[PDB]
């Protein structure tokens, strides 16, 4: 539940938000897309599993973790995206083609949105293009994200949190530097005003020899979190792999329905055929001789048409969309 | 298609940092001087000048390569084996035998020797590529000869193998805006271009 430097926040410009998209995956054959952000979904303040609410990074100086509900998150590329699942950093959703992806938490009027470019296209399987998996059709081998939230496409390494500095922790008065930690908290301070000097202060503390607040830094001693190895955060020196969390929604194999193209009408002439064709959508015709040359030909077809294909005594084979191969022999 | 991991940056903001050598795939790293990066407080350093930064990046297989991945094969002399059904007199038999003129097929009272083929043939070129059951007669580069933006830009003995070798032609650029970040540019996944 850290924050990343999203390149496109709500208004127009980059800024540091809890909802930064860091990577996006769309290899699933149904068009479902997996996303990863800095927020922890399905989790309350302490991290206990609960789907109805999520925790995320706060916009304050004590900078705690604050929570919201599933109703208030929306995702969209061109039209709104429908959520399919969420665990921690990761999301899975199905939604129409577009050029960029956006995730928005709508806390009332506080609608915070992060957008990142990703050219997502309507992708199909089989040899016939289609908007929609048909009700009737061949069941062909496809690979689709598993909606099971306890799966694992892999694993991701996270580390101890890095620096998190503040100048609200610092205070300037009469050209002099003080540190004001939050109540009851031991905050680690470090400065250089000539000599470089460090320390930890738990209360309102003076420093000497310092006139500019830019020369000193303060930050809470937080190791109670694990943060992904993100490039938007300056890191801890001990960046050892301090954990490994699974990548839910594994890309599992299954079977998908694909349509059955038009059954062609063959019109034959001496050592050659004239095949009459109908395909409202892009349909792939692949032909090949069966001799010492294949002479393989391929074509994506829309509308209706007619194709003249010479057939020799040795024979010819063709596949029209997802239909089965058909083989012929001239006389 | 490779996943470009860009580790979290590092700053020694009035000391010095140098370029260490790792064993990661197409490992790239470089050093900048005065940068003075901001993260959320508007300043993450003291001694704003002479502010060395270590910027790094490398690549791995994607977590989804477990399904979508191509494997490169060198084929050799094509051994041909035939299943055969015969009938003689009244009795019939099924048997599977090689065509070499050496290997005999047998059915329990019958012996037969088959081959060699009258005219040898193999539809497979010496260099082939397999992806999800689809075969291509593609001349893939030899192992270790990765080329950026070309097929086989990323190579490894196996998906779980740790000897990931790559030359993706990545180069890391100097940061410009005051906010902390790592800018870089990378060549397109040659796997995707071949796809």
């Amino acid at each position: 539940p850290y924050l990343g430097f999203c390149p496109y926040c709500r208004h127009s410009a980059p800024c540091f938000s809890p909802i930064k998209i860091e990577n996006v995956w769309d290899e699933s054959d149904d068009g479902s897309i997996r996303i990863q952000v800095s927020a922890q979904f399905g989790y309350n303040q302490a991290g206990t599993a609960d789907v109805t609410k999520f925790r995320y990074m706060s916009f304050d100086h004590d900078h705690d973790i604050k929570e919201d509900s599933m109703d208030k998150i929306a995702i969209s590329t061109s039209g709104p995206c429908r959520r399919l699942g969420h665990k921690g950093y990761f999301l899975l959703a199905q939604c129409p083609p577009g050029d960029s992806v956006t995730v928005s938490i709508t806390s009332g009027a506080s609608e915070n949105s992060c957008t990142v470019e990703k050219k997502i296209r309507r992708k199909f399987v089989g040899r016939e293009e289609y908007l929609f998996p048909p009700v009737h059709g061949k069941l062909v081998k496809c690979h689709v994200y598993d909606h099971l939230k306890e799966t694992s496409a892999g694993y991701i390494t996270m580390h101890r949190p890095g620096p998190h500095a503040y100048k609200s922790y610092l205070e300037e008065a009469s050209g002099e530097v003080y540190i004001k930690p939050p109540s009851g908290k031991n905050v680690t301070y470090e400065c250089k005003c000539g000599d470089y000097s460090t320390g930890i202060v738990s209360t309102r503390t003076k420093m000497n020899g310092c006139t500019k607040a830019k020369q000193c830094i303060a930050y809470k001693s937080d190791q109670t979190k694990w943060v992904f190895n993100s490039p938007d955060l300056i890191r801890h020196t001990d960046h050892s792999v301090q954990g490994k969390l699974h990548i839910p929604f594994r890309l599992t194999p299954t079977v998908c329905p694909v349509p059955l193209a038009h059954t062609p009408t063959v019109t034959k002439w001496f050592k050659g055929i004239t095949l009459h064709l109908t395909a409202t959508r892009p349909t792939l015709l692949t032909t090949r001789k069966l001799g010492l040359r294949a002479d393989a030909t391929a074509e994506w077809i829309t509308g209706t048409t007619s194709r003249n294909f010479s057939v020799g005594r040795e024979g010819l084979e063709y596949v029209w969309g997802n239909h089965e191969p058909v083989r012929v022999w001239a006389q | 298609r490779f996943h470009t991991v860009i580790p979290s940056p590092q700053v020694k903001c009035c000391g010095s940092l140098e370029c260490k050598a790792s064993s990661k795939a197409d490992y790239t790293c470089r050093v900048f001087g005065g940068v003075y990066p901001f993260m959320w407080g508007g300043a993450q350093c003291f001694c704003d000048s002479e502010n060395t930064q270590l910027s790094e990046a490398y690549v791995e297989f994607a977590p989804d390569c477990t399904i979508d991945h191509a494997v490169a094969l060198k084929v050799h002399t094509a051994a041909l084996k035939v299943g055969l059904r015969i009938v003689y007199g009244n009795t019939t038999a099924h048997l599977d035998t090689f065509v070499n003129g050496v290997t005999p097929g047998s059915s329990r009272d019958l012996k037969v020797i088959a081959g060699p083929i009258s005219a040898a043939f193999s539809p497979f070129d010496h260099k082939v590529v397999i992806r999800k059951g689809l075969v291509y007669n593609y001349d893939f580069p030899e192992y270790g000869a990765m080329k950026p933006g070309a097929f086989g830009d990323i190579q490894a003995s196996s998906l779980d193998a740790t000897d990931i070798v790559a030359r993706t032609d990545i180069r890391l650029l100097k940061p410009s805006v005051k906010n902390i970040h790592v800018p870089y540019t990378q060549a397109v996944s040659g796997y995707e271009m071949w796809k």
Partner: antibody
Framework: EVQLVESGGGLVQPGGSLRLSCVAS????????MAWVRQATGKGLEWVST?????????YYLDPVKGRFTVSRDNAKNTLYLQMHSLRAEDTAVYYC????????????????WGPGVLVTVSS | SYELTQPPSVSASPGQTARITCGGI??????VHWYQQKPPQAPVLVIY???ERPSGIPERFSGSNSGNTATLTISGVEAGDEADYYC????????????FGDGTRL
């Protein structure tokens, strides 16, 4: 070559005084913090004092050695110094001058270069 | 003031791995450094910042830190490893003091 060489140790009566010296070579003496560390015979390492860089404005000492021992530096001749007053019997030990390599974040300091050390004895 | 405890001795023939533990309250929240010493020679740093090493340290040496325990792990012990080892840290909230461990012998 980076080298630290101590000198000035020896025998002294309790309540006496001494000036231990450490000449430095092979590096920029002004660029690094220095420290005096101590080891009694058969015992572990115990930190004595640290002097900052380049001017050594702020100096830190172990609790019993405050007020009696004072660490100083000279960047011109590249020399660290520790003056001891009111010496006591258990001050008897081998003292090493050691560089301090410190990193701004997380505040963490360690000793990369150590001198061979020199023996001071406090006995009657 | 943090207190560091290590076992007074650890016994290991050559060939296997040896673990030496530094104990102290909440030391996993700080960065530990292990120094190796052969008396009368000066101590040499072998681990710093819980996870890395100076140049020239063989690949067998490794360090870890978590909670109430830090650990120096030395795979494939040899005769030359027989030495003394000090845990150390820099507690700065106690006036920039450098606490060393009691020491352990291999």
């Amino acid at each position: 070559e980076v080298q630290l060489v101590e000198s000035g140790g020896g025998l002294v009566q309790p309540g006496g005084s001494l000036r231990l010296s450490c000449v430095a070579s092979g590096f920029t003496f002004s660029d690094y913090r220095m420290a005096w560390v101590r080891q009694a015979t058969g015992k572990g390492l115990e930190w004595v004092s640290t002097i900052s860089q380049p001017s050594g404005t702020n100096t830190y000492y172990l609790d019993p050695v405050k007020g009696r021992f004072t660490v100083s530096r000279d960047n011109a001749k590249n020399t660290l110094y520790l003056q001891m007053h009111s010496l006591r019997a258990e001050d008897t030990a081998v003292y090493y001058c050691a560089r301090v390599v410190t990193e701004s974040r997380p505040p963490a300091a360690w000793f990369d270069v150590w001198g061979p050390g020199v023996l001071v004895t406090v006995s009657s | 003031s943090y207190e560091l405890t290590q076992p007074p001795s650890v016994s290991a023939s050559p060939g296997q791995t040896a673990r030496i533990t530094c104990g102290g309250i909440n030391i996993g929240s700080e960065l530990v450094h292990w120094y190796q010493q052969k008396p009368p020679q000066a101590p040499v740093l072998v681990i710093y910042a819980n996870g890395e090493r100076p140049s020239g340290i063989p690949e067998r040496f490794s360090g870890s830190n978590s909670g109430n325990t830090a650990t120096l792990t030395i795979s494939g012990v040899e005769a030359g490893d027989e030495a003394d080892y000090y845990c150390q840290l820099w507690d700065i909230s106690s006036d920039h003091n450098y606490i060393f461990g009691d020491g352990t012998r291999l």
